[PDB]
Design an enzyme around this catalytic site. Structure first.
Site, PDB file in Angstrom:
ATOM      1  N   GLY A  15       0.818  -1.230   0.000  1.00  0.00           N
ATOM      2  CA  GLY A  15       0.000   0.000   0.000  1.00  0.00           C
ATOM      3  C   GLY A  15       0.843   1.267   0.000  1.00  0.00           C
TER       4      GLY A  15
ATOM      5  CG  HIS B 152       6.350   5.100   6.769  1.00  0.00           C
ATOM      6  ND1 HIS B 152       5.157   4.684   7.328  1.00  0.00           N
ATOM      7  CD2 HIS B 152       7.296   4.249   7.217  1.00  0.00           C
ATOM      8  CE1 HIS B 152       5.375   3.635   8.091  1.00  0.00           C
ATOM      9  NE2 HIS B 152       6.679   3.346   8.039  1.00  0.00           N
TER      10      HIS B 152
ATOM     11  NE  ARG C 187     -14.783   4.475   2.780  1.00  0.00           N
ATOM     12  CZ  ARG C 187     -13.660   4.037   3.356  1.00  0.00           C
ATOM     13  NH1 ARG C 187     -12.511   4.019   2.695  1.00  0.00           N
ATOM     14  NH2 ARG C 187     -13.690   3.616   4.610  1.00  0.00           N
TER      15      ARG C 187
ATOM     16  CG  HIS D  97     -12.260   5.277  -4.820  1.00  0.00           C
ATOM     17  ND1 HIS D  97     -12.827   4.135  -4.288  1.00  0.00           N
ATOM     18  CD2 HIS D  97     -11.206   5.578  -4.027  1.00  0.00           C
ATOM     19  CE1 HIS D  97     -12.155   3.763  -3.219  1.00  0.00           C
ATOM     20  NE2 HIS D  97     -11.176   4.655  -3.011  1.00  0.00           N
TER      21      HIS D  97
END
Ligand SMILES: Nc1nc2c(ncn2[C@@H]2O[C@H](COP(=O)(O)OP(=O)(O)NP(=O)(O)O)[C@@H](O)[C@H]2O)c(=O)[nH]1
Lengths: 258, 619, 180, 70
Positions: B63, B106, B160, B226
């Site tokens: 991912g 990250h 979402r 999306h």
RNA sequence: CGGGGAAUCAGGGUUCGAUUCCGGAGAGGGAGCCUGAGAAACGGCUACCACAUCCAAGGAAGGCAGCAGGCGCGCAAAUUACCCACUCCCGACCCGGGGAGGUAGUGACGAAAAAUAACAAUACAGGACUCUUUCGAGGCCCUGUAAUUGGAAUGAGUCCACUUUAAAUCCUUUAACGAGGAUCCAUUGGAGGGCAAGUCUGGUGCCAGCAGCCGCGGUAAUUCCAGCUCCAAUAGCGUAUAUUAAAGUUGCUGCAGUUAAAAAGCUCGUAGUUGGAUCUCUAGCGUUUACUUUGAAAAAAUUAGAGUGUUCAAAGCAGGCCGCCUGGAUA
RNA sequence: UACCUGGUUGAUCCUGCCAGUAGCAUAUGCUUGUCUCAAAGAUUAAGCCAUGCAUGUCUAAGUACGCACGGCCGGUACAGUGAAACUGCGAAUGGCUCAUUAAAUCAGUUAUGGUUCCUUUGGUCGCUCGUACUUGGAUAACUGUGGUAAUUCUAGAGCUAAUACA
């Protein structure tokens, strides 16, 4: 290797062409024809290197493709066509006719002939056979297969052929006391008279030849070519009279001329 | 020599003055370098795949992403997505064109230790509603505030909610106004929350079409991940912001501002450098001075490779060869001996002006926190990574976890690398390891590693490499503790508890209270004063009836002791009395054994008794 | 395959013993007398002489009536008469062995330019030749190791272009003439 | 420890103070001593001598014509 | 891989030969075959074995030991360049194509020629030759550690114009500029012996180091680290390692074996090697060989070697005379 | 140029090797002004390869109804240059490398009277006793409809050539 070779490296070419080392990697590579690759001469060499007409390889095909050059009264445009011993090269543009005779030191010399002598050629008969209702046949050193030969013509005899036709005018028997020329080995290009042959059954026959200057040498039968009847030749000779004169008098002659 | 050096410096000065006084103005501006940051799984990438319309997003083997790259969108794509909603300025001459650079986000390797090679003309910050603000997002906006550049903020997970009427490829204003009211109220409430959450962090943010005054204001652009609603509004606001703000800075001048961005090891190409070619018409077969780890390198360009337009530096694409190339693009360069190079430094292209040096101490100031910190002089672990960025990430992890590193390399693992891991094995058995991240292990290397005592940690997802290494540290601690036990006798001074029930011999059951240190099983004991008499290896320590591993600094422990097989075991009263002290048998071997590799289980502030007992035992 | 020749030859032999007094002296005398650059140039002439002597020695062993010995012998003697280290009187193969390094070093263009009185020192001659002042026949040579032929001796003249001979002032004279 | 066969040998550094320029875990080119793989007048049980350190000739570091790359 | 050959060398020999010419072999490993005059072809196909590319996961496509280039391996090896103009090859073909091949770039593998100054004028408590017994007298000939004095000559570089070339480059040619610490700077190794060159002066003190070998260093180091001076070869000179001569220390020429290393404890004996005098032509032969002398056959390149001023030389196979006379030997 | 010199001893004469001496090749160090000639990923890994290129080809003379061009002459089958495709030939040479291979390869010498052979060059080609003033069918190219994520992948439909196939 697989199949036949198409190229020829320059240093691997036969020495009597006198190609230099640095000019290229490859050579002319005489194509298939009447005379052997080892013992022929490409037209590219004869025109470019010997007659000094063409400079590069292109000028040779530019000469030949304009159809100015005949070999034995037949037009050849192939620049790597093999013309060998006794073959008459004719340039009818400039009216110059050459016969390919080996010189003393053993190489094809630029020996001109009169246009009247560029009508015939001498040829050594390789075999004689007969076939298909018995028309006898003859085969010669330049691969000219001739039908209905004179029955007095035996193997190793010489025949004189008119170039315009394909018929035998006259012939010379291979006997003692006949003018011959050597076409192979150390004695290549030497003219002399036959003294005797020593027949070795199941092996090569050796002949003894006496030169005009009292020099006697031996040679294999295969490397002999009868050129004259008795002592008188039936063709013109090169600059020298086929006399192998030694390095001593080669130097004396050269220093005398200076 | 010095006169050539002097005129070389003066002709350099002439050239840069000409390249300053050249200065083309009046439109035809430079393509801006649009940066994109995020947290971990926000949607900083794959939105770019949606912009460029690329089918392959999930092909990352995880991912998360671990490299830098520029997608290189060119005007046809801007016009194509523009004509869909058609806002302003049909066939605008004034637009240079877009250049988007993707950055990996990250917690570990602190968001690519960034240092985002700066050059973030327009920074896109994914906020991603669903989760609110994140610690990497606050440290990223702190970094964006540290060097004052203009940046905007985009939402990702607006669709979402379960109840969003997914009407893709349309206006955000329209799509928001075409929903129910309660959802709009929920969106404006969480918008207000985000606006306050930026307002408190020294910003002034708002929703991208109110005032706007982007001089002081920042644009909250709501986008769908999306479906792609807002992607039009995005690129419109990007070109608008760049047109309005960056009018003078983005001039198509003729200085030499090529920057080394990424370093890669590709098969049959050597070591290639990805460069963002911004200013400077550098030519194929022209010398460049690349700033290296071990001094600068003179490199001769073999040629210029570019990936196809609307395609990333992600997967090995059909890289087209280009002889020369104008200053508005991100290109891959390859030459001879590009082995050790530094990332995020400017690249000097040189014509034949007899070697123009000395521009490195003026660059290498306070950016020394890089690979250069290599201790070849000392021992260390071996590290290999696909790209240089990943190698820095692994080294700063090792720095944080406190492990020295000896050798580093870029590309696949070979038999020389496992031999460097082997030549380490003689020094420290634990340190003889290779940390290989997203690189191909070779058969000869692997079989040579297995034949010797050299382990290799292969992993494509960096989490596995970190976890595997830390697991090995705990495994080696366990492997060290057990099978090398009871040599670290441990400091123990016992006071006898008088009037306790004594078992005489075979075994000895002794009721004691420790005065200095703590007491565990397998520690040999001795009584001084009565010469030096010995009781070898205490077998069990028990409180009342129950077993205990350690003494609690003044416990009433009844200990079962079996003296070692000798000619005679020692007796209570005859040899040692209740008044006599019980002291552990500590030697040079035991103190040296319990000094190193016993610093975590070892006692807290009772140390001194060792120095106090080694002096009486004579060490 | 390439159309190039690899026929290259070494022209000097180093001495067996590197440091030997009596030898070093003898070589330095030769350098000093004929203004040679380095000991390679003495070894070069020793090597060439040695090869001529070895050719004479291996010819002697053959019988006096052999055509090969006669031809080769005469050619060698002719060339050594031509180069000018012998005369018509002493033109026997036996006398080839009675030559030495002096005879060959005398025939250097440097030496002849000094001996004919064009240059006024053995060192000046080498410079004068190297500076393109000297010419043999109508050919400007700048090779000190040009071995002069016997018949080519009677004309070593200054190259016509030269300031010394031709009559054209050089850089120094031009500069002094302009600032004069 | 060599690169090809990965076995241990002891090499003698040549000139005065050359040991200072070498450090532990550096890449080193070593040559035969001179006596065809046998010992030296003094130093027993060594066949080899160090010629290059970290891709730099020890003669250059000794004579100061180069400096150890940092 | 085998030859033609290479290095070394008295005579004999020893060692090398993957590598440009000849012959053989194989295209990651084996195997099988289509087409064709010619293939068991790999820049043809078919299968398996080992590796590995794309992928919508259904299927698809692989072969640098051709030229570049990259990775690996290691002590060890060049440019992702330009052209078919030369030498040749292929095709229906004077016309097309060819990383065969040619030309540049990288190139201290190695080989040939050859800079880094020459001359003149000044003084020597300089040398020789003449005069005077000595002192002391000269355009007879040499001399340097003078940064003393002087103009003369000049290639290295800078850079027109050509010529060269397919187009360029290099060279040769030639305008302009270009030498006084001519700072336009000669290095690499030695200075006890082997072995050419210092028992000069600082420093260190059997520590640091040198030393192929013998040896030098422990407070006057001819040998270490330096300064000065000198020697050797010189645009080159060290160091390591395979190999040749030295090695008559592999001995056929040509070595040893009483004591230096060495003749079996002793005799028989097959194979092996060696072996005593003597015998003065009738198309077929004479008893047949070995030996020796002659002859023909034996690829060029290489090697020896004839001729030839490449400006000399290593080379090259050209060239020379005012359309001509030549050569491309010979062993 | 048919060559020797140091080292066992308190000293001597030996046997004997170690060391020195010169040449040749591979590496490597430091140094490097001019000019010609010139080797160069063989040794270890005949280990593995991204990318680009290295084998194509038409004369007056096998097949020209592609307007891709303009040209006659306009009732002239086919003026010409000529893409594409069918047909012919080449791709078995060249180049690379040295894994294999020990009477094998290979070298010198002989044999095919025991065999094949494109091509060139000669010979032969109404020697045979039985629609011809030119016979038949198709398929490329081209046009038109397509499939597959994908390759120098190819199916279906409509015409038309021969020195192709009969
Ligand atoms: N509907 C919706 N899908 C989302 C959202 N965020 C991510 N996704 C989807 O979740 C999947 C993985 O998210 P991804 O885009 O890789 O996250 P990232 O933060 O860009 N990852 P990376 O660290 O590699 O850059 C993708 O299919 C992506 O489209 C979101 O807010 N809404």
């Amino acid at each position: 290797a697989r199949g036949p070779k198409k190229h020829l490296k320059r240093v691997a070419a036969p020495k009597h062409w006198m190609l230099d080392k640095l000019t290229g990697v490859f050579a002319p590579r005489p194509s298939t024809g009447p005379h052997k690759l080892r013992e022929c001469l490409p037209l590219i060499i004869f025109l470019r290197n010997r007659l000094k007409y063409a400079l590069t390889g292109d000028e040779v095909k530019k000469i030949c493709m304009q159809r100015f050059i005949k070999i034995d009264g037949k037009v050849r445009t192939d620049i790597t066509y093999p013309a060998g011993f006794m073959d008459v090269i004719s340039i009818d543009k400039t009216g110059e006719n050459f016969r390919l005779i080996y010189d003393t030191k053993g190489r094809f010399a630029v020996h001109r002939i009169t246009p009247e002598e560029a009508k015939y050629k001498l040829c050594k008969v390789r075999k004689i056979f007969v076939g298909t209702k018995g028309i006898p046949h003859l085969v010669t050193h330049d691969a000219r297969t001739i039908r209905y030969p004179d029955p007095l013509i035996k193997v190793n005899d010489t025949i004189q052929i008119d170039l315009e036709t394909g018929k035998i005018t006259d012939f010379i028997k291979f006997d003692t006391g006949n003018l011959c020329m050597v076409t192979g080995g150390a004695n290549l290009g030497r003219i002399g008279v036959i003294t005797n042959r020593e027949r070795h059954p199941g092996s090569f026959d050796v002949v003894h030849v006496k030169d005009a200057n009292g020099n006697s040498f031996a040679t294999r039968l295969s490397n002999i070519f009868v050129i004259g009847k008795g002592n008188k030749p039936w063709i013109s000779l090169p600059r020298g009279k086929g006399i192998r004169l030694t390095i001593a008098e080669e130097r004396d002659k050269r220093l005398a001329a200076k | 020599e010095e006169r050539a050096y002097d005129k070389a410096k003066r002709r350099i000065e002439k050239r840069r003055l000409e390249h300053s006084k050249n200065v083309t103005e009046k439109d035809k501006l430079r393509a801006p370098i649009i940066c994109v940051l995020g947290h971990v799984d926000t949607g900083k990438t794959k939105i770019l795949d949606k912009l460029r319309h690329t089918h392959v997003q999930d092909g990352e083997a995880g991912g998360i992403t671990q490299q830098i790259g520029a997608t290189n969108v060119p005007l046809e794509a801007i016009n194509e997505q523009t004509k869909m909603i058609k806002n302003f300025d049909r066939e605008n001459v004034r637009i240079p064109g877009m250049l988007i650079i993707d950055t990996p986000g990250h917690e570990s390797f602190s968001n690519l230790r960034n240092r985002g090679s700066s050059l973030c003309d327009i920074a896109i910050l994914v906020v991603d509603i669903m989760h609110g603000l994140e610690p990497q997002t606050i440290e990223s906006i702190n970094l964006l505030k540290s060097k004052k550049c203009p940046f905007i903020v985009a939402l990702n997970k607006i669709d979402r909610l379960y109840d969003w009427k997914k009407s893709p490829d349309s206006d955000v204003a329209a799509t928001l106004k075409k929903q129910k009211k309660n959802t709009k109220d929920e969106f404006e409430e969480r918008a207000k929350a985000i606006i306050v959450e930026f307002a408190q962090q020294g910003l002034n943010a708002a929703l991208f079409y109110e005032n706007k005054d982007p001089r002081t204001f920042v644009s909250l652009v709501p986008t769908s991940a999306h479906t792609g609603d807002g992607m039009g509004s995005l690129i419109y606001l990007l070109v608008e912001l760049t047109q309005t703000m960056l009018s003078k800075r983005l001039a198509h001048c003729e200085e030499l501002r090529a920057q080394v961005m990424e370093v890669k090891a590709l098969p049959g190409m050597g070591t290639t450098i990805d460069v963002i070619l911004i200013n400077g018409r550098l030519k194929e077969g022209d010398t460049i001075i690349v700033p290296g780890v071990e001094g600068p390198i003179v490199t001769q360009i073999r040629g210029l490779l570019t990936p196809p337009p609307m395609k990333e530096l992600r997967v090995k694409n059909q890289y087209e060869k280009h002889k020369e190339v104008e200053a508005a693009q991100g290109v891959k360069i390859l030459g001879k001996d590009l082995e050790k190079t530094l990332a995020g430094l400017p690249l000097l292209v040189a014509y034949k002006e007899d070697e123009i040096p000395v521009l490195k101490d003026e660059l290498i100031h306070e950016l020394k926190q890089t690979l250069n910190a290599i201790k070849l002089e000392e021992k260390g672990v071996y590290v290999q990574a696909s790209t240089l960025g990943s190698l820095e990430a692994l080294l700063e992890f090792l720095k944080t976890s406190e492990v020295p590193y000896a050798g580093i390399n870029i590309g696949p693992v070979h038999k020389k690398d496992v031999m460097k891991a082997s030549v380490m094995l003689e020094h420290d058995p634990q340190y003889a390891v290779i940390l290989a991240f997203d690189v191909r292990i070779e058969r000869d290397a692997q079989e040579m590693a297995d034949s010797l005592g050299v382990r290799i940690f292969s992993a494509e997802i960096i989490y596995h490499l970190f976890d595997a290494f830390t697991k090995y540290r705990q495994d080696y601690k366990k492997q060290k503790q057990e099978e090398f036990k009871h040599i670290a006798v441990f400091p123990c001074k016992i006071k006898i508890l008088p009037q306790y029930i004594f078992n005489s011999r075979d075994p000895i059951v002794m009721g004691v209270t420790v005065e200095a240190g703590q007491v565990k099983q397998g520690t040999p004991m001795c009584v001084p004063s009565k010469n030096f008499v010995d009781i070898g290896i205490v077998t069990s320590i028990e409180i009342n009836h129950k077993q205990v591993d350690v003494a609690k600094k003044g416990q009433e422990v009844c200990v079962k002791i079996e003296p070692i097989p000798g000619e005679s075991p020692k007796m209570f009263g005859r040899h040692f009395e209740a008044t006599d002290i019980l002291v552990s048998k500590i030697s040079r071997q035991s103190i040296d054994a319990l000094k190193d590799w016993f610093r975590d289980e070892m006692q807290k502030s009772d140390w001194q008794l060792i120095v106090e007992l080694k002096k009486v035992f004579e060490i | 395959p390439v159309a190039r020749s690899w026929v290259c030859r070494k022209t000097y032999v180093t001495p067996r013993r590197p440091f030997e007094k009596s030898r070093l002296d003898q070589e330095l005398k030769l350098i000093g007398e004929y203004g040679l650059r380095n000991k390679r140039e003495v070894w070069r002439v020793k090597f060439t002489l040695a090869k001529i002597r070895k050719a004479a020695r291996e010819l002697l062993t053959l019988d006096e009536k052999d055509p090969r010995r006669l031809f080769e012998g005469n050619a060698l003697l002719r060339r050594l008469v031509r180069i000018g280290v012998l005369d018509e009187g002493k033109m026997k193969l036996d006398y080839i062995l009675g030559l030495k390094i002096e005879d060959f070093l005398e025939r250097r263009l440097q030496t002849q330019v000094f001996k004919l009185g064009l240059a006024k020192s053995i060192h000046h001659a080498r410079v004068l030749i190297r500076q393109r002042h000297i010419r043999v026949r109508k050919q400007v040579v700048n090779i000190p190791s040009f071995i002069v032929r016997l018949d080519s001796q009677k004309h070593i003249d200054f190259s016509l272009r030269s300031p010394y001979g031709g009559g054209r002032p050089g850089r120094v004279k031009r500069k002094n003439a302009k600032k004069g | 420890q060599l690169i090809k066969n990965g076995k241990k040998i002891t090499a003698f550094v040549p000139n005065d103070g050359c040991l200072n320029f070498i450090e532990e875990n550096d890449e080193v080119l070593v040559a035969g001593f001179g006596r065809k793989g046998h010992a030296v007048g003094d130093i027993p049980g060594v066949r080899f001598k160090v010629v290059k350190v970290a891709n730099v000739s020890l003669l250059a570091l000794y004579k100061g014509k180069k400096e150890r790359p940092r």
